[PDB]
Amino acid sequence: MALNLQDKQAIVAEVSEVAKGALSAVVADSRGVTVDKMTELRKAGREAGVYMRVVRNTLLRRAVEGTPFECLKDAFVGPTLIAYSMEHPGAAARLFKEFAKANAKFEVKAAAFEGELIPASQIDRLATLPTYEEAIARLMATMKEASA
Amino acid sequence: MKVRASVKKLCRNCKIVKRDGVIRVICSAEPKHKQRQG
Amino acid sequence: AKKVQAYVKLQVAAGMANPSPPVGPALGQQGVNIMEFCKAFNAKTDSIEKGLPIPVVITVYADRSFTFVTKTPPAAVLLKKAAGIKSGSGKPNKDKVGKISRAQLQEIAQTKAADMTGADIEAMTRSIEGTARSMGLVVED
RNA sequence: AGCCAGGAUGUUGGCUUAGAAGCAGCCAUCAUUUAAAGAAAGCGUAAUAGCUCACUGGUCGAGUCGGCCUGCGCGGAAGAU
Description:
CATH class of the largest domain in chain C: Alpha Beta
Entry title: Cryo-EM structure of Escherichia coli transcription-translation complex A (TTC-A) containing mRNA with a 12 nt long spacer
Keywords: bacterial coupled transcription-translation complex, ribosome, TRANSCRIPTION-TRANSLATION complex
Organism of B: Escherichia coli
Organism of A: Escherichia coli
Radius of gyration of chain B: 9 Å
Structural class of chain C: little secondary structure
Distance between the termini of chain B: 10 Å
Largest interface: A-C, 10 and 4 residues
Strand order of the largest sheet of chain C: 1-2
Shape of chain B: globular
Strand order of the largest sheet of chain B: 1-4
Oligomer: part of a larger assembly
PDB class: ribosome
Radius of gyration of chain C: 18 Å
Largest sheet of chain B: 2 strands, parallel
Order of helices and strands of chain C: HHEHE
Strand content of chain B: 35-45%
Shape of chain C: elongated
């Protein structure tokens, strides 16, 4: 905590993510370790490189300090710890699914998937955002339905 | 007892208390430290 | 990995798993077997190399039969056998006498990239500089 | 202030020593993952080990810290009809 010209940088980046971000989840790292974040690091690297940033910010004037602009439901995701997993170019492509998997490995917690605000709902682990490009499952029945 | 004209905290654990109008050094960690003004 | 139990890292001998003075029984005695360390450790160690310090951590809880694991070499000793003078200082660190190579310090860290947080392969190297300049080792860069 | 966590890598820095792994010393007192973590402040050891402490993260939700001037008080304060 230097004075104010340091924290505001955090708010700038966080508001940039929340406003200029996408679908995202929480990850409750009460006792964060080396390897949990390392696996999260690989997972974020898969999404187009480094834009699945996950910093340890559960703090009201720090992470809750960008809520008023965008994601105006983060006061209840303001408590003890929420390492919000904000997104960026793309979509939900596999962020929730990958979390839902890596948290179920006993990785510390995600506060019961408190959730971000893409929908008008609060907590619903969905699998309805894996497939967003596939255009070849429609060319599998063309050479088997001509004879008969 | 170190019963001393001069008494003082020695370490972080040493605490100064007066009881019955007398200074004592009382130390949680070190029995040696525990003192007395006399 | 997500949970560790304990580890005693020591520089032991790849050629033969049987030192008396250096470690001998001190290598593992608190549930560790000195008989399981010459029937499996040399099993994987003919497949890379033997002769230099190869630290090992042993997985012994109370069941007497562990699962040996490997390690990675030290980076400050990497500048002794691969960089220049072995010792590094020679004298107390007051006067710069040492040196290193320019093409090296880039590939001599790619081996030990399995224990480096800096994501970029070269951001791994930048850390080496600090390791390589421990005494002020002056690269003719 | 307490109360929950961490208190990590090169590393056990090297010698001289008997052994020296923070803690016998002499001496460099650096660098790394960085929330931070002393080549180490105590204890501890055969020496490791181990135990803390430093700094730092979590709860909590008003005050809090140590200097200056001066008033009055305490101790220092034991003799013999």
